[PDB]
Amino acid sequence: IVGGYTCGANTVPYQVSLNSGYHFCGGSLINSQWVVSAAHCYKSGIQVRLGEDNINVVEGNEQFISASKSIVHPSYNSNTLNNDIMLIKLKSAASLNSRVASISLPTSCASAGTQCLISGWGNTKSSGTSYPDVLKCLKAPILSDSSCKSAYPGQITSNMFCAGYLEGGKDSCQGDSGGPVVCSGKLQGIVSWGSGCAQKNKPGVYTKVCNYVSWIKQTIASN
Ligand SMILES: C[C@H](NCc1cc(C(=N)N)ccc1O)C(=O)O
Ligand SMILES: [Ca+2]
Numbered sequence: 051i052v053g054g055y056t057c058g059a060n061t062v063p064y065q066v067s068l069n070s071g072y073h074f075c076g077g078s079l080i081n082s083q084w085v086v087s088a089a090h091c092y093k094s095g096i097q098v099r100l101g102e103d104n105i106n107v108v109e110g111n112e113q114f115i116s117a118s119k120s121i122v123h124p125s126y127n128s129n130t131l132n133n134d135i136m137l138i139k140l141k142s143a144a145s146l147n148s149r150v151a152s153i154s155l156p157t158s159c160a161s162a163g164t165q166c167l168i169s170g171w172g173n174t175k176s177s178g179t180s181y182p183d184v185l186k187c188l189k190a191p192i193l194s195d196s197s198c199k200s201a202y203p204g205q206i207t208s209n210m211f212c213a214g215y216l217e218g219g220k221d222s223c224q225g226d227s228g229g230p231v232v233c234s235g236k237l238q239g240i241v242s243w244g245s246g247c248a249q250k251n252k253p254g255v256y257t258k259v260c261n262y263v264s265w266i267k268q269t270i271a272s273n
């Protein structure tokens with residue numbers, strides 16, 4: 051997260067860190083056994099880490115659970131990043147409490163101007179590499195479809211939306227990928243891509259979760 055602030059220990063209970071000997075992507079807990087992340091975050095040997103703040107120190111409240119299976123959307127296109135969504139089933143159900151809780155799926159899509167909370171342990175520098183120890187937060191609004199498409203001509207599909215600031219200085223970044231975009235208590239987006247980080251006229255692009263609610267439910271029900 052670039053230009054954000056320190057969230058505060060366990061203030062974002064649904065945030066998860068995907069770990070393979072190091073933090074490589076974020077994710078969101080949607081129930082005791084399932085996590086939603088980005089399809090481009092797929093890899094074998096994933097350990098899901100819940101209840102984290104400082105990802106380099108065991109502070110208490112952490113729960114490390116292995117992924118039993120990862121389900122990348124069948125129509126995911128790695129060239130366009132269309133359908134950039136993946137479901138991860140936990141080997142064992144997580145113990146839900148005040149520090150580890152699930153986030154609700156949306157019943158309807160969010161409108162432009164809606165304020166959302168984006169979080170993650172991704173890079174905090176627009177020019178260079180600097181990964182934080184603790185979870186970072188950023189309040190950002192969903193942009194109009196017209197501004198999004200004007201910023202990324204011919205690269206925005208119906209399954210994506212832009213959020214952020216056109217002036218630059220505030221944005222999600224590498225490492226935040228797969229993480230949550232929560233608006234009014236609902237998971238509306240997944241950190242997907244963007245041109246660089248916090249660059250002017252280049253807002254972040256996110257997977258539009260409201261288009262996948264039926265797919266998520268049907269997939270979870272059959273697995
Ligand atoms: C570098 C490029 N990722 C870019 C990227 C950009 C943003 C953003 N500006 N909001 C968020 C997450 C990302 O993963 C890539 O993975 O190829
Ligand atoms: Ca920790």
Ligand SMILES: [Mg+2]
Binds near residue numbers: 224225242243
């Ligand atoms: Mg990336």
